[PDB]
Symmetry: D2
Subunit: 335 residues, 4 copies
């Protein structure tokens, strides 16, 4: 019993994010599929689109952290049957260019501004039209639709980055910033078997880290901790200051991964980077395969993300709370 | 002016390959695309389907070595416009599973028996329906539709294998069997800058190799050639005998690549393979991206494949010729 | 107080392994180093040298699973000072050829028949002359000299192979044979975060596996377990039968690692290996760096090997016990 | 007939580089080896040590671009016999730490300030004491001692960087600065089969490039050349300006390699680097194995470096010439 009208929050550069009860319910052209949204997360990114003026285009339902159930499938759709529970791979790669075909759909030039809920329609509605089903990840049975939604960015982003760094059980990494996403980072790192050293200014952030399995936690790296000794450094703050710490403490041939949004530019010392073959790798969100891995890990209990439910219509208020960083535990919404 | 009826050679397990003047001309559902076939090759593979009983299913136009021009595109098709010249990526990966999304669409479990002209409809017709456009490679302007067609298997297969082996300019490889596809192998190997040593029983095969740029050519590997000294061995014959030569002459941590069809099983010496960390890697055809690379190489003139044209309807005779190995220079057909 | 005479067990092809109280105590030429043996293990390998006729040369103290303390260092030795506790990297790579310089000293052509206690002098003496100190791994303080000794083969071999397979937390591996070394394999695999499925005929072997953290344990792989679904297969039995199981159950582009000694030759099905890009990688023992990682893991308690001590002179009896497989829990000996 | 006194140019922070006729001729402690210097190059690096104040320590013969012949070998030296012609691997890695054992001896923490002729004694003498023979590369018979010496930095550095970038025949790279070392870079890149686009301000540099095999050469990159289209960018100038060009023109997931010395710091745009997964890899000189590859390539004639001979004693003047960049064609010296 699929309706033909539905409610949802659209975003318009003129009117901001406004609720609407007159939203269509597209039927699946063949190859496409209709997803009944079960849980959709909210993170800081969403706020940059609304307040901070991040241009992703105009007139789209929002929310990229999407989990839902297959409601209707166009003909020709054979990998998904109605009922199948799935998660949305944010970047919504095009699935046909050299980057997607090459295992990096997260950087697809063609899909720019066609990301779920950041160009294309998101999950802040009730029934989402999935133009390209390749960008879906089957949700393991033992995983709630809320937990999955939480993982689409909060866990996927860090997993992608740590995988990029090729962290192993012999790894000795440094994490700067255990608050933002950086919480799940710790669990993900540990799941790889690494020795994780966390660095944070805030006392809660540090306590959390301890409880989460961090091997060492510091306000400031001690003098006993020797320079150029970490195999990989993940800067979640990413400010000239923090990056400098990374380049100081990363070992030869190591990896510095600026995965924060704290400065528009960062500088590195050419002589040091060169002489010690330091590698600075940029990573962004995750691939469709990554999300597959992320759910296998959440399902396996190696990562447990922290989320609290809410009737979708309650969104507006949670956004004002988060706008003033009045909440810092992922919030998923049930439409 | 796209007709609605067309001619082509269908394959039926009951009647073999038979010409038909009553073939439909499917119009592109959105997302699909119609390809006017310009050149379609024929290779031994095709013969195993017809005589040797290789099961790929029933009732499909055949020929997987396909080159043609975009004639009509469904709506939603934005990466290809009418006119665009393209080549068919044989395996026709599904473009939505863990293997396709992960850069190995050539092993897509979902596309089994849906390969162009080996499960799904091939290029032995006039107008092919391309269900998934991801499996197309833009043909460089300076490349004839015949040369492209030649490359879809003859060159693509070896290129994929050699890339898999990570051959470099410092490589020292051994090639066994310069007749079958093995001809293009030599050029491809040289294009990577490797030192190629060819081994063949037939004298023509050897002469060809010389002319093609082989660094050394032998009937039998000389005693002066030291054991365990080749970085990679490509057995194009793949017979217990030839494989034994590879394992004898490949160096520690080297690669033995059984890329022939000469025996259903091959055995290796466990003690030697383990003690010298020998790697046996299986490869098959190529990926969509590989074909992209293959055309950049053919266009760049680093690989010139050998092909002779023919009106498509002339197919039946060429198949009887090849059936008794009466021809050994790729034959493309123009429909 | 370094003596100049010492006891130890030498191996002669004529007299077998015989105790000797007249053994020299070589003083360190510069660059060399003298190691006071603290614990030396015994494994099946040793038996093939003595009974089964494995040729490694003649007249050497035996035992390759070596742990000890630095007793005297030649001049020029700056990385090790007297006192430093170390473990012996079996292969004793040459440290100067393309393989050692290239991170694979375990396959050094130059060091053939110069392996500790399998060509060169081992640890079944009291004071071993370490010709090349590069082949030593500092033993973490919290690790007993017995545990270290245990790890030089028992753990090192499997860790090297698993790392070679690039097992990750998203991995889904299959292990065939949880008795021989295969016990530590399980822990090592788990330390990487993989999902381990074990397969063994013996009931104890299976029970052990369960207790050790195996995710699934079977006598025979169930029919519910789908073919071509494991990322990597480690055959510790390595018999045509077991290898066949691997090739049946390994997924496309997967890894089959014949790490057992059950047959001198094994055969694979060419068509399957090729069509599904299956990779057969041979591995052998471990590198110097591997042992570094192995001790960081043992020290970190991610792997706890099972060993029982014994006065070195008690060796002869333990060898007869093991000769009739009357003992199956690694035995280290203190000289 | 090995003397016991010899001439050479020592460097002292107080007196600069001064000739000396009273230099010892160390006899090889076992494991060591004595090299009769045949050719020793001179490059800008050497000038930073003498004028620009680069601290590498005190009192050492200089010149790191060393080629010579084995004159005496200590006992225990089995890989080299007297007579063997060899080249010096600059970094002189320690051959015993995690970095050297792991294939990156060029970043050895232990060998800091113990580099040939930049901490330890160089080739500006007649007979050099090679403490660690692992850091030697056999010189191919068809390669002059002068050409080898030229290659130890001039060719080795770029080869190491290009290999690090994994340039292939399908690569499309950008080179900024074809004067400094950047000349050999072009040949090296072409030896891998890449499509090389060079960018230089000076007109000679550009003309050279053309003659050297560059595919395209520009004063300023044209507007027809599309942004984010190069697989790898090598900045040999490395100035905020040039780096910016790299980040603008490198494609998604591409490589920017700041291999020049034009600025002490460089900044990158975080948003772009992250959103397009751009990788900035630092490289430095080369490994011992790299030099092995470099000589195989020079011997194979794929790279022909440009050098002019000179009696060693003529050094002082060539240094004043180069000091005012009055010469720009590598100069090797025969002692
Ligand atoms: O949604 C994300 C990544 O989590 C994002 C990050 C950078 C730019 C735009 C959006
Ligand atoms: O068409 C190919 C590869 O060229 C083939 C190879 C093996 C089995 C079936 C088909
Ligand atoms: O000691 C080992 C590996 O554990 C061995 C393995 C194969 C051949 C000779 C010796
Ligand atoms: O000699 C070199 C590399 O060519 C060098 C480069 C950077 C710092 C010190 C020395
Ligand atoms: Zn988000
Ligand atoms: Zn794409
Ligand atoms: Zn074919
Ligand atoms: Zn697929
Ligand atoms: Zn052993
Ligand atoms: Zn070696
Ligand atoms: Zn230099
Ligand atoms: Zn070192």
């Amino acid at each position: 019993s699929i309706p033909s009208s539905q409610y949802g929050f659209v975003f318009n550069k003129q009117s901001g994010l406004k609720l609407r009860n007159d939203l269509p319910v597209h039927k699946p052209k063949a190859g496409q599929l209709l997803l009944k949204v079960d849980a959709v997360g909210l993170c800081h990114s969403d706020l940059a689109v609304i307040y901070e003026g991040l241009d992703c285009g105009d007139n789209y339902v929002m929310g990229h952290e999407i989990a839902g159930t297959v409601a209707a499938v166009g003909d020709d759709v054979i990998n998904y049957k109605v009922g199948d529970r799935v998660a949305c791979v944010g970047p919504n790669g095009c699935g046909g260019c050299k980057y997607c075909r090459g295992a990096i759909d997260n950087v697809c030039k063609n899909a720019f501004g066609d990301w779920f809920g950041l160009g294309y329609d998101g999950g802040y509605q009730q029934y989402l039209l999935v133009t390209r089903p390749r960008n879906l990840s089957r949700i393991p049975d033992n995983v709630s639709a809320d937990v999955a939604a939480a993982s689409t960015d909060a866990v996927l982003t860090p997993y992608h980055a740590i995988k990029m760094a090729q962290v192993s059980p012999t790894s000795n990494i440094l994490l700067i910033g255990a608050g933002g996403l950086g919480g799940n980072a710790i669990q993900v790192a540990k799941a790889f078997g690494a020795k994780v050293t966390v660095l944070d200014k805030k006392k809660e952030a540090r306590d959390q880290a301890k409880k989460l399995g961090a091997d060492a936690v510091y306000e400031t790296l001690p003098e006993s901790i020797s320079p150029g000794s970490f195999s990989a450094c993940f800067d979640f703050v990413s400010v000239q200051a923090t990056f400098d710490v990374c380049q100081k403490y990363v070992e030869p041939k190591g990896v510095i991964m600026p995965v924060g949004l704290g400065a528009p530019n960062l500088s590195f010392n050419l002589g040091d980077l060169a002489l010690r073959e330091i590698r600075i790798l940029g990573s962004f969100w995750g691939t469709t395969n990554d999300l597959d891995d992320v759910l296998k890990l959440v399902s396996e209990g190696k990562v447990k993300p922290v989320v609290r439910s809410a009737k979708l219509k309650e969104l507006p208020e949670y956004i004002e709370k988060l706008r003033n960083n009045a909440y810092e535990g992922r919030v998923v919404f049930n439409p």
